From Swiss-Prot:
It comes from Centruroides sculpturatus (Arizona bark scorpion). Disulfide bonds join 12-65, 16-41, 25-46, 29-48. Residues 1-66 form the LCN-type CS-alpha/beta domain. The chain holds residues 20 to 85 of 87 of the full protein. The lineage of its organism: Eukaryota, Metazoa, Ecdysozoa, Arthropoda, Chelicerata. Beta toxins bind voltage-independently at site-4 of sodium channels (Nav) and shift the voltage of activation toward more negative potentials thereby affecting sodium channel activation and promoting spontaneous and repetitive firing. Induces immediate paralysis in crickets after injection, with a total paralysis occurring within 15-30 minutes and lasting for 1-2 hours. Is also lethal to vertebrate (chicks) when injected in very high dosages (more that 100 mg/kg). GO terms for molecular function: sodium channel inhibitor activity; toxin activity. One of its GO terms (biological process) is defense response. This is Toxin CsEv2. It comes from the Eukaryota.
Length: 66
């Protein structure tokens, strides 16, 4: 699936200045704990692709950052 990376501890999204092709969001997205396949900065936050069901995406059911 696609979505914003969420910090399992804060329930907050991962911020990112440089928009579009973002090497920083793509790394964090591919992380083994993430399992994603492709990430870029969108709306000033890290967006992801190819995430397995098991991995959570913003928001968090019991953890708010809003």
């Amino acid at each position: 699936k696609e979505g914003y990376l969420v910090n399992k501890s804060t329930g907050c999204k991962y911020g990112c200045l440089k928009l579009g092709e973002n090497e920083g969001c793509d790394k964090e997205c591919k992380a083994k704990n993430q399992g994603g396949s492709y990430g870029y900065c969108y709306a000033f936050a890290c967006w992801c692709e190819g995430l397995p069901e098991s991995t959570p995406t913003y928001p968090l059911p019991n953890k708010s950052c809003s």
